[PDB]
Design a protein around this nucleic acid. Structure first.
Lengths: 115, 115
DNA sequence: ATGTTCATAG
DNA sequence: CTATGAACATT
DNA sequence: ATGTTCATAG
DNA sequence: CTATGAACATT
């Protein structure tokens, strides 16, 4: 790595944590939800991308799965996520501020140097 | 595309324009120069990357080359760049502010939503 | 899309 | 030993 | 690294 | 028709 700007991967990973920290949801939902909180700014991620973030937070030993099967019209086997390791959860939820803080400087530096 | 953050490619492209707008230099120089203006922030790009940016601004019909051969110890056939199309130069030097302005919002949005 | 290694040139 | 590229390889 | 298409499951 | 994945493909 050269340490440019934050990867989309890590960016989403962080939204999951935050959203899990409260809403406690499943993939396809998050996607739709994020697609609304960024619609205006024109950032539209995709399920596959959203999914990969979740799966990653698995091997990182954090968010663990938790499958649910209910009865009725929306008869899905929807998959929710909760915290596995909360220690790592806030360990990561900070080494990500650092990157967002570092990545801001650039967009500023650029926006200033060039303009 | 999904319109996440600005690619490194376009980021550099912009520095070239700006730097050409005044300094008028050659590849390996820019690299070393950029490596100093970002050292502190910890962003260290590479020649290959810097090079690709230049070459790209070629087919975009803008920066045109201009090879020079002098005599003495540093006997290089160093390759400088100047403006081909200045109309496109400021056309692009704005659709890049738009991306830097758009890409800032995110790092803010993130840094705010999550924190 | 971008980083790491190899080619040629002086 | 510097400069400019391209091929190769990875993410 | 990330986007676009295909597989399976209800 | 939605949900979750993985394979495939591109940048």
């Amino acid at each position: 790595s050269t340490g440019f700007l934050v990867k989309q991967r890590a960016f989403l990973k962080l939204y999951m944590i935050t959203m899990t920290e409260q809403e406690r949801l499943y993939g396809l939902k998050l996607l739709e939800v994020l697609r609304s909180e960024f619609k205006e700014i024109g950032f539209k991620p995709n399920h596959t991308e959203v999914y990969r973030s979740l799966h990653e937070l698995l091997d990182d030993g954090i968010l663990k799965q938790i499958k649910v099967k209910k009865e009725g019209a929306k008869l899905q086997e929807v998959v929710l996520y909760q915290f596995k390791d909360y220690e790592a959860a806030k360990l990561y939820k900070k080494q990500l501020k650092v990157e967002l803080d570092r990545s801001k400087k650039l967009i500023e530096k650029a926006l200033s140097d060039n303009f």
